[PDB]
Design an enzyme around this catalytic site. Structure first.
Site, short mmCIF file in Angstrom:
data_model
loop_
_atom_site.label_atom_id
_atom_site.label_comp_id
_atom_site.label_asym_id
_atom_site.label_seq_id
_atom_site.Cartn_x
_atom_site.Cartn_y
_atom_site.Cartn_z
N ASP A 34 4.76 12.71 7.55
CA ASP A 34 3.61 11.98 7.00
C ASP A 34 3.86 10.48 7.14
O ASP A 34 4.60 9.89 6.35
CB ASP A 34 3.39 12.36 5.54
CG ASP A 34 2.12 11.78 4.97
OD1 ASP A 34 1.44 11.01 5.69
OD2 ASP A 34 1.79 12.10 3.81
N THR A 35 3.23 9.87 8.14
CA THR A 35 3.32 8.42 8.31
C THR A 35 2.61 7.68 7.19
O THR A 35 2.90 6.50 6.95
CB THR A 35 2.73 8.01 9.65
OG1 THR A 35 1.37 8.45 9.74
CG2 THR A 35 3.54 8.61 10.80
N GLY A 36 1.67 8.33 6.50
CA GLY A 36 0.98 7.71 5.38
C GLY A 36 1.74 7.72 4.08
O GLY A 36 1.24 7.19 3.08
C1 LIG Z 1 -0.38 14.03 0.66
C2 LIG Z 1 -0.72 14.62 2.05
C3 LIG Z 1 -0.44 16.16 2.11
C4 LIG Z 1 -2.16 14.33 2.47
N1 LIG Z 1 -2.54 12.92 2.25
C5 LIG Z 1 -2.14 11.85 3.29
C6 LIG Z 1 -0.90 11.03 2.80
O1 LIG Z 1 -0.43 10.25 3.84
C7 LIG Z 1 -1.23 10.11 1.61
C8 LIG Z 1 -2.32 9.10 1.97
C9 LIG Z 1 -2.21 7.86 1.09
C10 LIG Z 1 -1.63 6.68 1.61
C11 LIG Z 1 -1.53 5.54 0.81
C12 LIG Z 1 -1.99 5.57 -0.50
C13 LIG Z 1 -2.56 6.75 -1.01
C14 LIG Z 1 -2.67 7.89 -0.21
N2 LIG Z 1 -0.05 9.36 1.26
C15 LIG Z 1 0.84 9.80 0.17
O2 LIG Z 1 0.51 10.69 -0.54
O3 LIG Z 1 2.06 9.14 0.01
C16 LIG Z 1 2.55 9.07 -1.31
C17 LIG Z 1 4.12 9.61 -1.30
O4 LIG Z 1 4.85 8.60 -0.81
C18 LIG Z 1 4.02 7.29 -1.11
O5 LIG Z 1 3.68 6.72 -0.05
C19 LIG Z 1 2.17 6.15 -0.30
C20 LIG Z 1 1.60 6.88 -1.24
C21 LIG Z 1 2.66 7.81 -1.75
S1 LIG Z 1 -4.02 12.67 1.38
O6 LIG Z 1 -4.19 11.29 0.96
O7 LIG Z 1 -4.00 13.37 0.07
C22 LIG Z 1 -5.41 13.23 2.43
C23 LIG Z 1 -5.78 14.58 2.43
C24 LIG Z 1 -6.83 15.01 3.21
C25 LIG Z 1 -7.50 14.11 4.01
N3 LIG Z 1 -8.63 14.58 4.86
C26 LIG Z 1 -7.14 12.78 4.02
C27 LIG Z 1 -6.08 12.34 3.22
#
Ligand SMILES: CC(C)CN(C[C@@H](O)[C@H](Cc1ccccc1)NC(=O)O[C@H]1CO[C@H]2OCC[C@H]21)S(=O)(=O)c1ccc(N)cc1
Lengths: 99, 99
Positions: free
Chosen positions: A25-27
């Site tokens: 997960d790059t996000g």
């Molecule tokens: C949690 C994943 C299974 C899926 N997610 C993408 C994910 O990259 C989120 C997307 C994300 C990115 C930034 C801020 C909020 C959400 N980031 C995230 O949850 O990371 C958290 C854990 O480590 C920390 O890093 C940043 C947030 C924390 S998600 O936001 O819930 C998502 C789910 C479905 C869709 N269509 C679009 C996005």
């Protein structure tokens, strides 16, 4: 390897002697895993996603073997719906986005 | 380009005549953006992640230019804390993980 994104970039990881599948997960800034037991002292923390926040337990200097690549770093344990490999560990196995 | 992951993979996008920065998120199945106007009809939907769920509005066949790469696909609009380019659009621009 080169992973295409038509399916979820799921890979096999080995942590604490256990095999699991985790989401590259790059996000995610930090690595977050479902409930499990780990060594060392842990300290509380809260992380925020799309639907709010959860309470996790932060473990530092934890060895993970991501699809064969070893890495040591922070691992967060909490009620995440998915095992997630965050950027804190993706950088160590030298992973990059390319298009 | 090749994007390393020491910093959040933020890129410049162009949607609905507006300029924004979005997060190349391999963990996101679909693209999610903050509130904005888009053309055409939409349908209600709910997407879940770390922390719970949010209510979004699904727009289909929406043109986006990601780092100068044009793509048409589903775009979800809702109270996401970050603009997220999901796998539904990352595939169209030839994005791959490499390590
Ligand atoms: C949690 C994943 C299974 C899926 N997610 C993408 C994910 O990259 C989120 C997307 C994300 C990115 C930034 C801020 C909020 C959400 N980031 C995230 O949850 O990371 C958290 C854990 O480590 C920390 O890093 C940043 C947030 C924390 S998600 O936001 O819930 C998502 C789910 C479905 C869709 N269509 C679009 C996005």
């Amino acid at each position: 390897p080169q992973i295409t994104l038509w399916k979820r970039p799921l890979v096999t990881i080995k942590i604490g002697g256990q095999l699991k599948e985790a989401l590259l997960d790059t996000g995610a800034d930090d690595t977050v895993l479902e409930e499990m037991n780990l060594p060392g002292r842990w300290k509380p923390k809260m992380i925020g996603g799309i639907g709010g926040f959860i309470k996790v337990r932060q473990y530092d200097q934890i060895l993970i073997e991501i699809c064969g690549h070893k890495a040591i770093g922070t691992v967060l344990v909490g009620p995440t719906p998915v095992n997630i490999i965050g950027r804190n560990l993706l950088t160590q196995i030298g992973c990059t986005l390319n298009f």
